[PDB]
């Protein structure tokens, strides 16, 4: 048995994760880190990102963890080039043309691009095709959380006063079962889900704080919001963690009975799981390579079979 020779590109939660993950797969090696920085803290030997390619054949699998909003969209093509890569790309608007750039440099070079894994993109978007093309008539909805929210937690701490803060997004536990039954083809976003933000700050900015948050335009006006101004040890304490999750709900009609499909997701912390899916999709990434393909794929076009460690007549054998 030759382990797959896995290297991780970016250091930062999504890279720790996967360094971490990689020591409980039976078929992968930790070759090493590629970095900007010089100076990481692990004992993972560390390359510059410039040096990739003299390292092309000592990597079967290159898991590209840097940043989705500049970084991605730019650098990943290049690394296409050098060995099979797989990203957690989460830019949906984009994803289209991401899957054709990738797919390109990835033929080119003879590789298998995965583009856009993780939980969702990834996880969830695998069961809104299955569910959908199982139910032809069909409602469907995707609710985030209980989880934090980086977008909203910025808005929350550049409020004048606010010392340290985090929101977070809960599906409407009212809009879930509505879903559930079937009667939730009308309602808006700012029903679908609560905002709960925890503030640190002096007491005698309570006041306007809290009203300029329930005031903030696209934010949180509109929404069911509740806010807890908490101690400092309260929030270093319960509010430092990366938790996540989500509802996928699908509902149909057969002539007069529903079928409701739920998938749901709890992650305690939201790195560990989006590498876990990373790391599956590199092990399906590099059998397809194997198998005389190339090009880029998105988590649609993967038969389930190929992320497990496993061999196809075990998993039929036991599974199915
Ligand atoms: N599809 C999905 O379900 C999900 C996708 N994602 C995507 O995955 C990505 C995860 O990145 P994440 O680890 O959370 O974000 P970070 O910002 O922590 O990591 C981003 C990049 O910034 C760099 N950097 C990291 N830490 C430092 C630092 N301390 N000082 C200076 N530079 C640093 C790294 O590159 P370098 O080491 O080279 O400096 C790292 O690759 C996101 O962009 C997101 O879009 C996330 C969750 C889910």
Known sequence: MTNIRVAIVGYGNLGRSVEKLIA??????????????????????????????????????????????????????????????????????????????????????????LVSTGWDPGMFSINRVYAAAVLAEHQQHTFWGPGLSQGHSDALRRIPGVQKAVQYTLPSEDALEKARRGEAGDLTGKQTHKRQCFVVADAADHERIENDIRTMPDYFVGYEVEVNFIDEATFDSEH???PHGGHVITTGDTGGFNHTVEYILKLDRNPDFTASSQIAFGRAAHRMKQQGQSGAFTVLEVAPYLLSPENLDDLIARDV
């Open 24 to 113: 409980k797969q039976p078929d992968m090696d930790l070759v090493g880190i590629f970095s900007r920085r010089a100076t990481l803290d692990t004992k993972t030997p560390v390359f510059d990102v410039a040096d990739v390619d003299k390292h092309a054949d000592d990597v079967d699998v290159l898991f590209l963890c840097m940043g989705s909003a500049t970084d991605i969209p730019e650098q990943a093509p290049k690394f296409a080039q050098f060995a099979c890569t797989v990203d957690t790309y989460d830019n949906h608007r984009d994803i289209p043309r991401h899957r054709q750039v990738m797919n390109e440099a990835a033929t080119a070079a003879g590789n298998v691009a």
């Open 240 to 242: 430092t963690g990366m």
